[PDB]
């Protein structure tokens, strides 16, 4: 299988390198005959002789057009004849493209900024990560000596840990009596020892957590300080550092540097992205953090080195475990988009769609439009208006069904052939007109994007069938990832239409999809109201909550199934309405804010106060109010609960344990008290404090709370904690803040 591609320059000529892993053997293939090229649209074919003589300079050397050939391509559905201009080296293109564009007879130039190694994969039809080759992986982490006020990598590397199927080990230059610790004489010997393990193990994948912006940079500066050739690459190279906007990225030639940090940053949403928080969210198991001060103290005193070595071992162990969990998904994403795992794991949704489109465009002889210039880019940042949101019916409702469209936006794009190449195509015999906006889309031929989107949905179904039929659990997980990634790619096309940097950007397409979506949801609502007697309580973009106010639970379910059969027969093409849940009770506060409860008595919420500055009394009272309303149907009881809680708080009857806040006023006051005890100020959600009557404008750690010495601030927990947490819920029922505080 293909791992990656790149190029080196030898005597001014580019040489493509294909890094492969075939039958348990690493291989490098070379291609010295791939010519870089760009396209040029001319007003007259006679002008080609003027374009051939256009020259520029790279580094003293004169860059010129090697040869040209006239080709026939499609450009936004219309046939076009352009000149394919060949060059000696890919770096000739940035040097001459402006001089060719500025030529009067040149209407425009195309495909002039496509990286050579990526252009090779597309043009040769090569797909990375394809096949059943098993890759060898190795995770690693480092521990450093930190001092506040010193330059980057001023202190030495204390330990280097690594982990794989054989387990986790720690290399260090101090005596540690642990079975998994290997002891060397110096920091230099430790780094050299790590090089030998990577060389002997010869892993295809090097797994790190934030290795792009820390680990590799630290190792690089230390190896320069110690005079070590840090040869991690399979061809004898040192790790290559690249610039990715405001941050960095590291390649290790011949292998795949898989940095888990950007991957997990996109996949899951967490308050903090420390290695400890991430591991605990994915595996549900705890991981203790050992801070830089504790590491430095242990190394200088020589006391407690077992604890630091165990932490270093766990870092490598959990990084290998997380790498085993996220790599197969990224390998499937690489197969899907057609680019290396290295690029795919570090790219955004917009870039992933573009690279998929660029490959498909080449396959279909479709000339790709250019990226927007700075002027055009500013023109594409205009406001938006898409998605219907109904203002909800106020009050408590019973026996509610939730109905929604299956893939509304992709269905619209396919059904109505929405594409920049079908938009207002003159002489069209058949067309669909977008409501309100009035954009017409030709139906005479399949549009580029709807055609690909249709093939994606067909491929997804073929993948789902294979998944359900395969007994092999590893293959089932792989098919599951591919299937899920196809769904995500299909649901990225709408957003891509309105994506300012997109080559195939089309605001008319984007507005048309939302206008059609507004029409389908609004027509379905009036249909269920007029012909089935349902009341639509709330609706947002592709679904709605409905009920028959005086009907029982089985009656509402039956009528909903009958409505689905009715409207699905009327819906065109791929559009389909679905039954996605029944709820015993529910209330809809405002747009995007509501709460509902299923038959299993499970409360589902959206748009509630549930920030980091919150106590167990505020969380408990909100749950109690929600339960009284949704489970008992008693809104007056929910009010009495708040009145009871505020009265108990004012009379000091609430236990202090329910007043602890876990995390500017209280926070800075508690920070001073914690720093006074030797505890360093570190970013973490571990601060547990309680607010006292401080008579200032007051916070102490909960461990030090004593009822005989301290009295909590009842007014603070009423006005800043309990009331704000329940206020939005009870304001929907007509109650003000003052109607609850006794």
Residue numbers in the entry: 1 to 610, 612 to 664, 676 to 709, 713 to 757
Paper excerpt:
Archaeal DNA polymerases from the B-family (polB) have found essential applications in biotechnology.
In particular, the compartmentalized self-tagging (CST) strategy enabled the discovery of polymerases capable of processive HNA synthesis. To better understand how the mutations added on TgoT variants impact the structure of the polymerase, the X-ray structures of the apo form of TgoT, replicative polymerase TgoT_6G12, and reverse transcriptase TgoT_RT521 were solved by crystallography. The helices α19 and α20 are part of these regions. Hence, overall, the crystal structure of the wild-type TgoT appears more stable than the two variants studied here. For instance, compared to their initial position in the Tgo DNAP structure, helices α19 and α20 of the thumb β subdomain of TgoT shift by almost 5.5 and 6 Å, respectively.
